[PDB]
């Protein structure tokens, strides 16, 4: 019962960590594109 809840919480935390790792690169690419296309001309 409680062990299953703890394991689910650990899995959710790992998934959230991977999600944040992906979002870091996502926002990095967004900033890079939006800042490089702005210096055009």
């Amino acid at each position: 019962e409680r062990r299953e809840i703890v394991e689910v919480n650990k899995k959710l935390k790992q998934k959230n960590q991977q999600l944040k790792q992906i979002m870091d690169q996502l926002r990095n690419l967004i900033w890079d594109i939006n800042a490089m296309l702005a210096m055009r001309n």
Binding site: K15, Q18, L19, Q21, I22, Q25, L26, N28, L29, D32, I33, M36, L37
Partner: protein
């Protein structure tokens, strides 16, 4: 554009006229039909090649003073290079994000 093809055709015609003159002289001096017409055509082609060469030499002489048409759109070349570099960086970042997502799932 068309002047290059014109000069190439003029050179080919000069070569053909030389060949035709040689062949006509050979046929006329071999023994004694169409040698007269052949010699006439060879002379006409030689005169035409000479006229074409004289006309090409008597061109408008665009500049003849300095290096003309200075500037080969280097700005556009650099802009295209930067656009290609942007596309490449976007592709690399997208591949990195895809690898991260694949490692996630």
């Amino acid at each position: 554009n068309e002047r290059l093809r014109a000069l190439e055709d003029i050179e080919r015609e000069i070569g053909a006229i030389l060949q035709n003159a040689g062949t006509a002289i050979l046929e006329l001096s071999k023994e004694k039909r169409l040698l007269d017409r052949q010699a006439a055509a060879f002379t006409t082609s030689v005169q035409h090649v000479e006229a074409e060469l004289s006309a090409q030499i008597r061109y408008l002489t665009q500049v003849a003073t300095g290096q003309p048409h200075e500037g080969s759109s280097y700005s556009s070349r650099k802009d295209c290079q930067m656009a290609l570099k942007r596309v490449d960086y976007a592709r690399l970042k997208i591949s990195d994000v895809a690898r991260t997502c694949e490692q996630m799932l």
